[PDB]
Design a protein that fits this description.
- Two copies of one chain form a homodimer.
- Chain A is mainly alpha-helical.
- Chain A has one domain.
- The first copy, chain A, has seven helices and no strands.
- In chain A, α3 packs antiparallel against α4 and α3 packs across α6.
- The longest helix of chain A is centred in the N-terminal third of the chain and has 17 residues.
- Chain A is globular, with a radius of gyration of 17 Å.
- The first copy, chain A, starts with 12 loop residues before the first helix and ends with a helix.
- The interface between A and B is large, with 49 and 57 residues.
- Chain A: It is found in: Host cytoplasm; Virion.
- Chain A: This is Transcriptional activator VP30.
- Chain A: Belongs to the filoviridae transcriptional activator VP30 family.
- The PDB classes it as virus.
Protein backbone atom coordinates (compact mmCIF):
# COMPACT_ATOMS: atom_id res chain seq x y z
CA UNK A 1 0.00 0.00 0.00
CA UNK A 2 1.91 2.98 -1.39
CA UNK A 3 2.44 6.46 0.05
CA UNK A 4 0.58 9.46 -1.26
CA UNK A 5 2.30 11.59 -3.94
CA UNK A 6 4.67 14.11 -2.38
CA UNK A 7 4.64 17.60 -3.86
CA UNK A 8 -8.85 19.63 -32.02
CA UNK A 9 -11.22 16.71 -31.20
CA UNK A 10 -9.80 13.51 -29.73
CA UNK A 11 -11.43 10.18 -28.88
CA UNK A 12 -11.96 10.55 -25.15
CA UNK A 13 -14.15 8.03 -23.35
CA UNK A 14 -16.91 10.69 -23.45
CA UNK A 15 -16.65 11.05 -27.22
CA UNK A 16 -16.53 7.27 -27.73
CA UNK A 17 -19.87 7.17 -25.88
CA UNK A 18 -21.39 10.11 -27.76
CA UNK A 19 -20.49 8.52 -31.10
CA UNK A 20 -21.79 5.12 -30.09
CA UNK A 21 -25.03 6.63 -28.87
CA UNK A 22 -25.46 8.98 -31.81
CA UNK A 23 -25.12 6.07 -34.24
CA UNK A 24 -27.19 3.72 -32.07
CA UNK A 25 -30.12 6.11 -32.30
CA UNK A 26 -29.86 6.44 -36.10
CA UNK A 27 -31.40 4.30 -38.84
CA UNK A 28 -28.75 2.80 -41.13
CA UNK A 29 -30.62 2.50 -44.49
CA UNK A 30 -27.46 4.24 -46.32
CA UNK A 31 -24.15 3.11 -44.89
CA UNK A 32 -21.33 1.71 -46.96
CA UNK A 33 -18.89 -0.92 -45.81
CA UNK A 34 -16.38 1.68 -44.55
CA UNK A 35 -18.99 3.01 -42.15
CA UNK A 36 -19.98 -0.55 -41.16
CA UNK A 37 -16.37 -1.60 -40.58
CA UNK A 38 -15.86 1.44 -38.34
CA UNK A 39 -19.18 0.73 -36.58
CA UNK A 40 -17.91 -2.80 -35.94
CA UNK A 41 -14.70 -1.46 -34.36
CA UNK A 42 -16.68 1.08 -32.32
CA UNK A 43 -18.97 -1.69 -31.02
CA UNK A 44 -16.12 -4.04 -30.09
CA UNK A 45 -14.32 -1.24 -28.22
CA UNK A 46 -17.58 -0.21 -26.57
CA UNK A 47 -18.11 -3.78 -25.37
CA UNK A 48 -14.59 -3.82 -23.95
CA UNK A 49 -15.33 -0.71 -21.89
CA UNK A 50 -17.95 -2.73 -19.92
CA UNK A 51 -16.87 -5.02 -17.12
CA UNK A 52 -17.32 -8.66 -17.96
CA UNK A 53 -19.78 -9.08 -15.08
CA UNK A 54 -22.02 -6.92 -17.27
CA UNK A 55 -21.40 -8.96 -20.44
CA UNK A 56 -24.53 -10.98 -19.73
CA UNK A 57 -26.45 -7.72 -19.24
CA UNK A 58 -25.53 -6.49 -22.70
CA UNK A 59 -26.48 -9.82 -24.18
CA UNK A 60 -29.83 -9.94 -22.60
CA UNK A 61 -30.58 -6.35 -23.43
CA UNK A 62 -29.66 -7.44 -26.98
CA UNK A 63 -31.82 -10.57 -26.86
CA UNK A 64 -34.89 -8.71 -25.64
CA UNK A 65 -34.77 -5.69 -27.98
CA UNK A 66 -34.17 -8.04 -30.92
CA UNK A 67 -36.51 -10.90 -29.80
CA UNK A 68 -34.00 -13.69 -30.36
CA UNK A 69 -34.57 -17.42 -29.91
CA UNK A 70 -32.32 -19.37 -27.56
CA UNK A 71 -30.64 -20.44 -30.81
CA UNK A 72 -29.23 -16.96 -31.39
CA UNK A 73 -29.29 -15.84 -27.77
CA UNK A 74 -26.52 -18.40 -27.14
CA UNK A 75 -24.52 -17.21 -30.17
CA UNK A 76 -24.95 -13.54 -29.22
CA UNK A 77 -23.60 -14.08 -25.72
CA UNK A 78 -20.61 -15.98 -27.06
CA UNK A 79 -19.88 -13.18 -29.56
CA UNK A 80 -19.97 -10.57 -26.77
CA UNK A 81 -17.53 -12.72 -24.75
CA UNK A 82 -15.16 -13.24 -27.72
CA UNK A 83 -15.21 -9.48 -28.44
CA UNK A 84 -14.62 -8.66 -24.79
CA UNK A 85 -11.57 -10.99 -24.79
CA UNK A 86 -10.46 -10.02 -28.31
CA UNK A 87 -6.78 -9.29 -28.87
CA UNK A 88 -5.40 -7.61 -31.98
CA UNK A 89 -8.85 -7.64 -33.55
CA UNK A 90 -8.60 -11.33 -34.49
CA UNK A 91 -12.18 -12.33 -33.74
CA UNK A 92 -13.56 -8.98 -34.94
CA UNK A 93 -11.79 -9.47 -38.27
CA UNK A 94 -13.21 -13.02 -38.57
CA UNK A 95 -16.72 -11.64 -37.93
CA UNK A 96 -16.32 -8.99 -40.63
CA UNK A 97 -15.03 -11.38 -43.28
CA UNK A 98 -17.12 -14.51 -42.55
CA UNK A 99 -20.52 -13.54 -41.16
CA UNK A 100 -23.37 -12.61 -43.43
CA UNK A 101 -22.87 -8.87 -43.69
CA UNK A 102 -26.57 -8.10 -43.01
CA UNK A 103 -26.86 -10.17 -39.84
CA UNK A 104 -23.56 -8.60 -38.78
CA UNK A 105 -25.16 -5.18 -39.38
CA UNK A 106 -28.09 -6.12 -37.11
CA UNK A 107 -25.72 -7.39 -34.43
CA UNK A 108 -23.50 -4.29 -34.53
CA UNK A 109 -26.51 -1.99 -34.25
CA UNK A 110 -28.06 -3.86 -31.33
CA UNK A 111 -24.65 -3.94 -29.65
CA UNK A 112 -24.37 -0.14 -29.80
CA UNK A 113 -27.91 0.12 -28.41
CA UNK A 114 -27.08 -2.19 -25.54
CA UNK A 115 -23.70 -0.63 -24.72
CA UNK A 116 -25.10 2.89 -24.45
CA UNK A 117 -28.17 1.72 -22.53
CA UNK A 118 -27.31 -0.85 -19.83
CA UNK A 119 -25.82 0.37 -16.53
CA UNK A 120 -22.05 0.12 -16.48
CA UNK A 121 -21.99 -0.87 -12.77
CA UNK A 122 -24.17 -3.63 -11.27
CA UNK A 123 -23.63 -2.85 -7.56
CA UNK A 124 -26.50 -0.63 -6.41
CA UNK A 125 -24.48 0.97 -3.63
CA UNK A 126 -21.83 2.12 -6.13
CA UNK A 127 -24.64 3.28 -8.42
CA UNK A 128 -26.27 5.36 -5.68
CA UNK A 129 -22.89 6.53 -4.40
CA UNK A 130 -21.88 7.95 -7.78
CA UNK A 131 -25.34 9.29 -8.46
CA UNK A 132 -25.34 11.28 -5.18
CA UNK A 133 -23.15 13.82 -7.02
CA UNK A 134 -26.00 16.09 -8.04
CA UNK B 1 -29.42 4.46 -14.18
CA UNK B 2 -25.64 4.76 -14.52
CA UNK B 3 -24.96 4.14 -18.18
CA UNK B 4 -21.44 4.73 -19.50
CA UNK B 5 -22.58 8.01 -21.06
CA UNK B 6 -23.94 9.47 -17.84
CA UNK B 7 -20.96 8.20 -15.85
CA UNK B 8 -18.93 10.34 -18.27
CA UNK B 9 -21.19 13.40 -17.99
CA UNK B 10 -20.85 13.21 -14.22
CA UNK B 11 -17.05 12.77 -14.28
CA UNK B 12 -16.69 15.64 -16.77
CA UNK B 13 -19.04 17.99 -14.92
CA UNK B 14 -17.13 17.43 -11.68
CA UNK B 15 -13.65 17.54 -13.19
CA UNK B 16 -14.31 21.04 -14.56
CA UNK B 17 -15.69 22.50 -11.32
CA UNK B 18 -13.85 23.74 -8.23
CA UNK B 19 -14.05 21.69 -5.02
CA UNK B 20 -13.13 24.49 -2.62
CA UNK B 21 -16.41 23.90 -0.80
CA UNK B 22 -17.24 20.18 -0.65
CA UNK B 23 -17.80 18.01 2.42
CA UNK B 24 -16.41 14.54 3.02
CA UNK B 25 -19.67 12.99 1.81
CA UNK B 26 -19.19 14.42 -1.69
CA UNK B 27 -15.50 13.54 -1.66
CA UNK B 28 -16.15 9.93 -0.75
CA UNK B 29 -18.60 9.62 -3.64
CA UNK B 30 -16.04 11.33 -5.93
CA UNK B 31 -13.39 8.77 -5.00
CA UNK B 32 -15.82 6.03 -5.97
CA UNK B 33 -16.61 7.77 -9.28
CA UNK B 34 -12.91 7.96 -10.12
CA UNK B 35 -12.30 4.28 -9.30
CA UNK B 36 -15.16 3.25 -11.59
CA UNK B 37 -13.94 5.61 -14.32
CA UNK B 38 -10.38 4.28 -14.12
CA UNK B 39 -11.85 0.79 -14.49
CA UNK B 40 -13.52 1.93 -17.73
CA UNK B 41 -10.14 2.43 -19.44
CA UNK B 42 -8.18 -0.42 -20.95
CA UNK B 43 -5.20 -1.53 -18.93
CA UNK B 44 -2.69 -0.45 -21.60
CA UNK B 45 -3.89 3.16 -21.16
CA UNK B 46 -3.12 3.16 -17.42
CA UNK B 47 0.30 4.66 -18.17
CA UNK B 48 -1.38 7.38 -20.26
CA UNK B 49 -3.46 8.35 -17.23
CA UNK B 50 -0.34 8.29 -15.10
CA UNK B 51 1.57 10.58 -17.40
CA UNK B 52 -1.27 13.05 -17.73
CA UNK B 53 -1.67 12.96 -13.97
CA UNK B 54 2.02 13.63 -13.39
CA UNK B 55 2.40 16.29 -16.00
CA UNK B 56 -0.69 18.32 -15.12
CA UNK B 57 0.36 18.21 -11.45
CA UNK B 58 4.01 19.19 -11.99
CA UNK B 59 5.09 16.08 -10.05
CA UNK B 60 8.61 14.73 -10.08
CA UNK B 61 9.31 11.51 -11.96
CA UNK B 62 10.15 10.18 -8.47
CA UNK B 63 6.42 10.02 -7.84
CA UNK B 64 5.38 8.72 -11.29
CA UNK B 65 5.77 5.05 -10.27
CA UNK B 66 3.68 5.65 -7.13
CA UNK B 67 0.95 7.30 -9.21
CA UNK B 68 0.96 4.49 -11.72
CA UNK B 69 0.68 1.99 -8.87
CA UNK B 70 -2.44 3.69 -7.60
CA UNK B 71 -3.99 3.60 -11.04
CA UNK B 72 -3.22 -0.09 -11.42
CA UNK B 73 -4.58 -0.94 -8.00
CA UNK B 74 -7.72 1.02 -8.71
CA UNK B 75 -7.97 -0.76 -12.05
CA UNK B 76 -7.67 -4.20 -10.28
CA UNK B 77 -10.06 -3.40 -7.53
CA UNK B 78 -12.86 -5.79 -6.48
CA UNK B 79 -15.26 -4.98 -3.72
CA UNK B 80 -13.85 -1.48 -3.27
CA UNK B 81 -11.19 -3.06 -1.08
CA UNK B 82 -8.19 -0.98 -2.15
CA UNK B 83 -10.42 2.06 -2.69
CA UNK B 84 -11.46 1.82 0.97
CA UNK B 85 -7.87 1.34 2.19
CA UNK B 86 -6.73 4.36 0.15
CA UNK B 87 -9.60 6.47 1.47
CA UNK B 88 -8.89 5.91 5.14
CA UNK B 89 -5.05 5.79 4.87
CA UNK B 90 -4.29 8.84 2.74
CA UNK B 91 -4.95 12.29 4.20
CA UNK B 92 -7.77 14.41 2.81
CA UNK B 93 -5.53 16.68 0.75
CA UNK B 94 -3.44 14.12 -1.08
CA UNK B 95 -6.65 12.24 -1.79
CA UNK B 96 -8.51 15.34 -3.03
CA UNK B 97 -5.71 16.29 -5.44
CA UNK B 98 -5.32 12.73 -6.76
CA UNK B 99 -9.06 12.18 -7.28
CA UNK B 100 -9.44 15.56 -9.03
CA UNK B 101 -6.49 14.91 -11.31
CA UNK B 102 -7.97 11.46 -11.96
CA UNK B 103 -11.28 12.95 -13.13
CA UNK B 104 -9.41 15.42 -15.39
CA UNK B 105 -7.19 12.72 -16.84
CA UNK B 106 -9.86 10.00 -17.11
CA UNK B 107 -12.28 12.14 -19.13
CA UNK B 108 -9.60 13.63 -21.39
CA UNK B 109 -6.96 11.09 -22.46
CA UNK B 110 -7.83 9.04 -25.56
CA UNK B 111 -9.39 5.76 -24.46
CA UNK B 112 -7.61 3.84 -27.26
CA UNK B 113 -3.84 3.79 -27.95
CA UNK B 114 -3.98 2.47 -31.56
CA UNK B 115 -4.04 5.24 -34.17
CA UNK B 116 -5.83 2.97 -36.67
CA UNK B 117 -8.63 2.15 -34.23
CA UNK B 118 -8.80 5.88 -33.41
CA UNK B 119 -9.01 6.98 -37.04
CA UNK B 120 -11.60 4.30 -37.78
CA UNK B 121 -13.90 5.29 -34.91
CA UNK B 122 -13.41 8.99 -35.63
CA UNK B 123 -14.58 8.54 -39.24
CA UNK B 124 -18.13 8.51 -37.76
CA UNK B 125 -18.18 12.00 -36.17
Amino acid sequence: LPPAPKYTESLTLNRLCEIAQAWASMTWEDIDDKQLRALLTLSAVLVRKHSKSQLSALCENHVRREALAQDQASIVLEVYQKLHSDKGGKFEAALWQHWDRGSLTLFIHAALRAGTTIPCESSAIVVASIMSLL
